Design a binder for these strands. Structure first.
Ligand code: TEL
Lengths: 37, 175, 206, 142
RNA sequence: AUAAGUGCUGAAAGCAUCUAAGCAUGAAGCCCCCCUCAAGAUGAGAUUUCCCAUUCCGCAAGGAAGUAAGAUCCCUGAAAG
RNA sequence: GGCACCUCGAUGUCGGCUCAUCGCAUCCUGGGGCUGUAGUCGGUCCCAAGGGUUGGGCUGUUCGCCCAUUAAAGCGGUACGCGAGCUGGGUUCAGAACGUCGUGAGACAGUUCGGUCCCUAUCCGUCGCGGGCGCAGGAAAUUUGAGAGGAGCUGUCCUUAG
């Protein structure tokens, strides 16, 4: 992941999905895989 | 610009039978599918047509108004034709087979992988590379297809292991 | 889940089809009798009683004589109970012999350990002592009772008290030999208890 | 000088079915009934309550995410000996203790409060031995 | 049964998505299985078996005085202390 | 460190020994996501406190360096846990000496050598063992388990297989 309290999109293909109560960035690039915590 | 506003038409090979409270049973040539829905969404039977209606315009009624209808439509599609997932596997001595019902994947491990499709799912192995999961539910064909892919997810350097039909597997140049 | 109960005699020393020595316990089990076959329909659990020894008439009481003479053998000294047995095979009044066990299979043994008495923290709980020299007045003593903030000692500060006398199981023991005519089990290893004391030999929970 | 009644206390047996309710709103009307707060011959020191039977404990329900989040904590007297059970772990295993712990909390504390806890007997399902006493079928106010 | 994680179905939001519903995996951790104690668990439980429902009072409740099965005092002791 | 709120009709102060327990901001082991992760090894991160977490040299030392192991040699709470449990090396009494300061008696977070560690446990609290009564008759045995404690660590070698 990228567990960081400032979750935000990096590229143009990142998506910001509020999964199960946590705001995540889900991308095709797996380094841009993020989650707040 | 909405799934739930349209119609779903039921020409033939699919008989939709409302039987109990929200339990929709759909019968046909392949198999029968039963699904119990949430009692807020209402489903009416036009002559060979399902029509879906929501009580209000709320956060959960829009979601159920999509999902109840979409699951009804996939029940109609899996009763009419069924579903199937293709499973390419690439390697050096990487291979699949079947013994009776049980799928035997001899893929990379020093042990055999023995998968049992218990609920009634037809697994084809048409050739020693491919594995096809075939049945009625998307929720069950895709489930056991992911169960087969979970045996070996693909490495990114050499694409090894189980792999779907047109899965763009990420490529790393590990030198 | 098979099992008998017997009495401890001593340790012997047995070669086994090779030059290998085996330390052996000898357990003498004159054949047990099912005294009460407890069922699930009233007692809530499926177990069985077994009796082992032959008391005299003088030592035994009328409730013992009645409970035994339901299935007439003799009033018995040690009644114990085995849970979850093959209750199709056992019946009330059946001589549960030593012919059950063989030299092959694995065995859990429960016996009442040797009593030691009021003993200190080092022989009881295996603690280490302070130095016997360099001015120290501290040895053979149980330790600091604890910290100061709880204003008390926690439960479980291990102290002197009576050591021994608990029922204790050694698991996965192995049988060397069975003498059914002398009513003897030979068991590889060490089995807890004093001499002439009752020890119950179950099958292993493997 | 009002009535201060003692050993003139006829005790009623009630059946409260718990098959759909919330346990906080059931046990608040049950733990008030177990002291006789509904009885006009109420003295605070002689246990003027009546007997309460709770039937179908395993179907009592909760609001929100309380089944997984409400944690029954129970420390022993041993260090590191706090034990935890969720509300579903109490629900599916034994709902009788879960209901009796609510009512132990909502009944007053002391010797007589334990004496009033003695009146209540919570059961799983509808077995309910207790036919020897005419237990009336009781409905809760809300 | 889960935690991290990985997913199916899958909308809201013609798509996409491990999502609100529905489902599934997944740890030396949680609950058991394993060992010990444990009904003073005052919620004091349950089995099997033994003894039987006597003698006076007093107008009753109740009291006392022999006992039954059983146990104990005292004694011989150790495997127990 | 600031402040001086409790204690100067006394709250013994470091390190060690014994005995632990607790927190997780996890040292190993367990499960994982990312990689500038080919493999073996790694880096970082997420979840996890269940268990484990060495023996010496010098030093009073905690700490630190070093030797040799380990799977790892984790950080911190508990009056920097624990002296009515122990030691007394160091601090912090009276002797004496050095350097230095002071005219001086003497003084030094300067050094050095030597220096009285008292208490029969009342109560709580722990660890064990009994005696009473209860348990709606009196007894002898066998028990169910609510609940509670324990245990819970892990290496290397072979095979898969060079
Ligand atoms: C033998 C034990 C002595 O304790 C200690 O001295 C010592 C072990 C302590 O630690 C003790 C507990 C001290 O308390 C501490 O005081 C500190 C100032 C404070 C401490 N806390 C308050 C922090 C506090 O614990 C104190 C002040 O004692 C000085 C207690 C105080 C009441 C005493 O002075 C006390 C009466 C001592 N004393 C005075 C004579 C001493 C001379 N002497 C030596 N040997 C003989 C002797 C030998 C043989 C024959 N005859 C005589 C005579 C005695 O005779 O016996 C004593 C009790």
């Amino acid at each position: 992941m990228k567990v960081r309290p400032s979750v935000k999109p990096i590229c143009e293909k990142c998506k910001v999905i509020r999964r199960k109560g946590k705001v995540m960035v889900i991308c095709e690039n797996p380094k841009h895989k993020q989650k707040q915590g | 610009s909405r799934v739930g506003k349209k119609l779903l038409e039921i020409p033939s090979d699919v008989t939709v039978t409302l039987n109990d409270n929200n339990t929709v049973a759909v019968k046909g040539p392949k198999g029968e599918l039963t699904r119990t829905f949430h009692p807020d969404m209402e489903i009416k039977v036009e002559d060979n047509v399902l029509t879906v209606a929501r009580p209000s315009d709320q956060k959960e009624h829009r979601a159920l108004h999509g999902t109840t209808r979409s699951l009804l439509g996939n029940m109609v599609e899996g009763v009419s034709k069924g579903f199937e997932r293709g499973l390419e596997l690439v390697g050096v001595g990487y291979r699949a087979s079947k013994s009776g019902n049980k799928l035997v994947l001899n893929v990379g491990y020093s042990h055999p992988v023995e998968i049992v499709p218990e609920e009634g799912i037809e697994i084809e192995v048409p050739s020693q590379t491919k594995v096809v999961v075939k049945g009625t539910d998307k929720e069950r064909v895709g489930a056991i297809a992911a169960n087969i892919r979970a045996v070996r997810s693909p490495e990114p350097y050499k694409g090894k292991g189980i792999r779907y039909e047109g899965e763009v597997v990420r490529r790393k140049e590990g030198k | 889940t098979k099992g008998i109960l017997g009495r401890k005699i001593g340790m012997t020393q047995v070669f086994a089809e090779n030059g290998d020595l085996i330390p052996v316990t000898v357990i003498e089990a004159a054949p047990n009798v099912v005294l009460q076959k407890k069922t699930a329909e009233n007692d809530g659990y499926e177990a069985i009683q077994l009796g082992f020894d032959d008391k005299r008439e003088k030592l035994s009481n009328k409730p013992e004589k009645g409970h035994v003479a339901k299935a007439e053998t003799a009033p018995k000294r040690f009644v114990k109970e085995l849970r979850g047995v093959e209750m199709d095979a056992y019946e009330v009044g059946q001589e549960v012999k030593v012919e059950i066990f063989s030299a092959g299979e694995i065995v859990d043994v429960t016996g009442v350990s040797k009593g030691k008495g009021f003993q200190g923290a080092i022989k009881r709980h295996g603690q280490s002592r302070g130095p016997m020299s360099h001015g120290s007045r501290y040895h053979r003593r149980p330790g600091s009772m604890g910290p100061v903030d709880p204003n008390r000692v926690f439960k479980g500060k291990l102290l002197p008290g009576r050591m021994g006398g608990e029922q204790i199981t050694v698991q996965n023991l192995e049988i060397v030999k069975v003498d059914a005519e002398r009513n003897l089990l030979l068991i590889k290893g060490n089995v807890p208890g004093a001499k002439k004391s009752l020890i119950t030999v179950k099958s292993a929970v493997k | 000088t009002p009535m201060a009644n003692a050993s003139t206390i006829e005790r009623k047996w009630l059946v409260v079915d718990a098959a759909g309710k919330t346990l906080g709103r059931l046990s608040s009307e049950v733990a008030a009934i177990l002291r006789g707060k509904h009885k006009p011959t109420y003295t605070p020191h002689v246990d003027t309550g009546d007997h309460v039977i709770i039937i179908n404990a395993e179907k009592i329900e909760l609001t929100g995410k309380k089944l997984t989040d409400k944690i029954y904590y129970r420390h022993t007297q041993h260090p590191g000996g706090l034990k935890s059970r969720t509300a579903l772990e109490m629900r599916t295993n034994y709902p009788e203790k879960m209901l009796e712990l609510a009512i132990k909390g909502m009944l007053p504390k002391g010797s007589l409060g334990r004496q009033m806890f003695k009146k209540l007997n919570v059961y799983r399902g509808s077995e309910h031995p207790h036919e020897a006493q005419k237990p009336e079928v009781y409905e809760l106010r809300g």
